[PDB]
């Protein structure tokens with residue numbers, strides 16, 4: 001699980017290029033289109049340090 | 060110079076004016092001047108510069124095609 005623990009974005013489009021269609025490249029300037037929130041794809045564990053609330057838990 | 064107005068995409072990595080890089084470990088290159096930034100930024104697309112993360116910057120240079128950086132980042136000659 002990508003537990004985006006609450007969703008927020010402030011942009012970044014960042015994690016899409018880590019988890020390529022797991023976040024899909026629609027960022028909705030508070031949202032990113034997390035298409036596949038099941039996938040503990042460890043590249044998104046970097047992108048905790050680009051969420052403003054560091055708001056990706058994984059499980 | 061426009062920056063912030065089309066920087067809406069990039070805020071989570073930077074703040075407003077290159078003022079962080081946050082990717083995770085990323086180089087906050089600020090204390091710069093527009094020309095150098097433009098060269099570095101073009102460099103990111105052509106593989107003539109890179110960074111630790113730096114593929115998002117490649118995409119940014121590509122989709123803000125790689126003249127819109129003169130709108131965006133050619134600003135940052137304050138630091």
Ligand code: HEC
Nearest residue numbers: 014069072077080082085086088099110111112113115131
């Ligand atoms: C979030 C994933 C990013 C997006 C989208 C944008 N930038 Fe970025 N930028 C990011 C990183 C990780 C880095 C550091 C390099 C590394 O990989 O270690 C940068 C760097 C810059 C710089 C510094 C100067 C340079 O190297 O050219 C500038 C001035 C900069 N970024 C500007 C910028 C603009 C204008 C963007 C909005 C369109 C933008 N960045 C998006 C990460 C991210």
Ligand code: SF4
Nearest residue numbers: 009012013015047051
């Ligand atoms: S790294 Fe976080 S705040 Fe940034 S686009 Fe991705 S989910 Fe959003």
